[PDB]
Design a protein around this ligand. Sequence first.
Ligand SMILES: OC[C@H]1O[C@H](O[C@H]2[C@H](O)[C@@H](O)[C@@H](O[C@H]3[C@H](O)[C@@H](O)[C@@H](O[C@H]4[C@H](O)[C@@H](O)[C@@H](O)O[C@@H]4CO)O[C@@H]3CO)O[C@@H]2CO)[C@H](O)[C@@H](O)[C@@H]1O
Ligand SMILES: O=C(O)CNC(=O)C(=O)O
Ligand SMILES: [Mg+2]
Length: 624
Amino acid sequence: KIEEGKLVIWINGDKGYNGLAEVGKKFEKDTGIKVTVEHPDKLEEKFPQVAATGDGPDIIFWAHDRFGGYAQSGLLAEITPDKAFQDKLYPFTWDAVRYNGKLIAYPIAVEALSLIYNKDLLPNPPKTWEEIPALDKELKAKGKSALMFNLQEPYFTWPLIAADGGYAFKYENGKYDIKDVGVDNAGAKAGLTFLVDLIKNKHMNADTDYSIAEAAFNKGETAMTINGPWAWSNIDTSKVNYGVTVLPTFKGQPSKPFVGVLSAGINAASPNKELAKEFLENYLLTDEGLEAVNKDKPLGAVALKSYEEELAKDPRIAATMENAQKGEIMPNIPQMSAFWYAVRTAVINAASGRQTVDEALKDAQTNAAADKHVNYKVFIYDHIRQIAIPTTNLNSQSSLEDIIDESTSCQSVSTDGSIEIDGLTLIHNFLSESEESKILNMIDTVEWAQSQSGRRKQDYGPKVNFKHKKVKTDTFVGMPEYADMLLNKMSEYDVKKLGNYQPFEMCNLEYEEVKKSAIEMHQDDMWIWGNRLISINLINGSVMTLSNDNKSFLCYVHMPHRSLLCMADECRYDWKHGVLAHHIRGRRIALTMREAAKDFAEGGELYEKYGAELIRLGNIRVPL
Ligand SMILES: OC[C@H]1O[C@H](O[C@H]2[C@H](O)[C@@H](O)[C@@H](O[C@H]3[C@H](O)[C@@H](O)[C@@H](O[C@H]4[C@H](O)[C@@H](O)[C@@H](O)O[C@@H]4CO)O[C@@H]3CO)O[C@@H]2CO)[C@H](O)[C@@H](O)[C@@H]1O
Ligand SMILES: O=C(O)CNC(=O)C(=O)O
Ligand SMILES: [Mg+2]
C-alpha cells in the first residue's frame, strides 16, 4: 500500500513541480513529514490503475476533467473543508471539483489557452484564423513563420474546432447529456477542415508537438504560438518580447478553449488524508504557497481570492480570462477521457492525411461514447509472412473465434498497409504432445499460488520489489528440471533469436476460463528482466493482444496450443501485451521465462550486488 507518515504527490511535468516541492520543504521543516513531489509520465493514466489496488500517490494534481472518472470508482476521498476555508476560494472553482454533490478535490488555478505572439515580428496579431495563411506567406518570405503550436494534443486544437459549433456533450436541464455528442457536426468539421488545410498548404507541420512549437517561439522563429500560463516562465527567460491576447475568431465566431481548473485530489487509499488536508489547505492554498508554485511556472487565475487580488493586474491573466470567457469549463464526467482519446485520434489522423476530416470525426463521434483501444488501428498477425495485416473485420472487442478465423484468412490478403513488429517471434508447434505431457506432469506435482486477475502461479526466481529496486533470494533455490530441455530446444530451433538465454525467472501462469482469468495490458519490468520474454502455451492456446500507444496500433497474435512466443526489441520496449479474459478457453498454463537484464549480467552495475548471485541460483535445478 501507501506508506504512512509521509506524502507522495503527483503533478504533471509542465507545471511548477519544483515550486511545489519547495512548499513541501516548508511542510517538512514545520511538521517533520517528508513530502516527495513526482512528475511521472502519463500520471493521469497510472493513477486509476495503482489507486484501485491501494497504491499510488497520496495527492494527485490534474485539471478537474479527469476527476469524475476517478471519483466514480471511489479513488478520491471526499474532502471536508470547513466553511471558513471554503470561503477563501472562488465558488465557481469549487463547482468544478464537485461530483454527485460531493467535493472531490481542492481547486488550485484556472487555466485557458491564449494566443501568444512575438511583438517584434508581429506588432498587430491577426483577429481571425482566416488571415493566417496570408500572414504566413508574408513571414515565410522573411525567414519566419506565422504560427506553431502543439498539434498532438486535442486540447490545443479544440478552441478552433468548437468555434463554429463543435462540442463535447450538450448541457441540458442541469446535467451533461452523454447521449448528445457534438464532435462530428458541421461546426466541428469546418474547424478541423481549416486546420488540415493549414497543414496541406504548408503553413503548419502535422508533426509539430509541444517542445517543437515552444522552442521555435522561444528562439524567435515563429510569430505566434498557442499555450497556457505554465508556458510563460520559459518565454520570460528567453526575453522574447511577447504578448498574450485573445485567440483568433473562426467563421466570424470566437475560438472556444476548454477551460481547466488545476485540482488536487486525495487518494482514497491514502492513510495520510489528514496530512494531505493540512498540506493543501494551510501550506499550498496560501499566498506564500501559491507564490512559490507561481514563481516556478505560472498557474493562471488562482482559486484563492487573496492571492488572485495580488495577481489581477497581470495583463497575461486578463487575456487568459478573456479567452476563458469565450470557451467553457470542461465537464468532469467520466466520459471526458473517452471524448479526448477520440478527438486526439481524429485530429492526428486527419492532419496526417490518413483519413478525411469527415471520417476521422465520424469515428471520434462514435468512440466518444465508449478503453482507449477502440480508437486504434487493428492488425492481425500473419505468422507465415511474419507481418501484421490491417483488418477492419476485427476490433478491440473481437472474439477469439473471429481472431482465429482472421489469422488464417489474412494470409491471402495484399500486404498493403501491413507492418513489421521487430522482435515478435512465433513458433507454431514448439512442443510435441509428449514433451508437453512430460512438463505438465512435472508441473502438477508442484504447489500453485494465488495471484492477480484469477491466475495462479508457480514462481521460480527471486522476490522483487520493483518499486524500491530490492531483491530477495531467500525463496530462489533454482529453476524447474524441465528448464534445460526448453532452453536447448530454443537454441536448436533458432540460435540467433532464442539462444544464449540465461533464465533469471521462470514463472508458470495458470488461467481458467471458469475463473475469468486474464492478464491486463502491460510492459514487463526492464530493471531486472532483459530483452527477450518467452511464453509457451500449455494445454490450450490463446491470443496475445499487442498495443502501441505511440502509433495507436492494436495487433492480435493468435498463439495456438503448444506454441512458443518470444517478445523482444521493438515488441518488448515499444508495445504492451496482455491476454484478455474472453480469449481464454478451458485451462491454459503460460510457461514463461525472463532473462537477465544488462545491469545484472557479467558486466553490469548490479552484477556484484545481485547479478552474480542470481546467475548461480538460476544455474541449479530442482528435481521433480
Ligand atoms: O496515448 C495517447 C495519449 O493518452 C494520454 O493523454 C490523454 C489523457 O490521459 C486524457 O486525460 C486527455 O487529456 C486531456 C486533459 O485531461 C485535459 O486536462 C487537457 O490537458 C491539458 C491540461 O489541462 C493543461 O493543464 C496542460 O497540461 O496541457 C494539457 C494538454 O496537453 O487536455 C488533454 C487533451 O489534450 O486526453 C489525452 C489524449 O489526448 C497520455 O497522457 C499521453 O501521453 C498519450 O500520448
Ligand atoms: O502469456 C501470458 O499468459 C502472459 N504473459 C506475459 O505477460 C509475458 O510473457 O510477459
Ligand atoms: Mg508480460
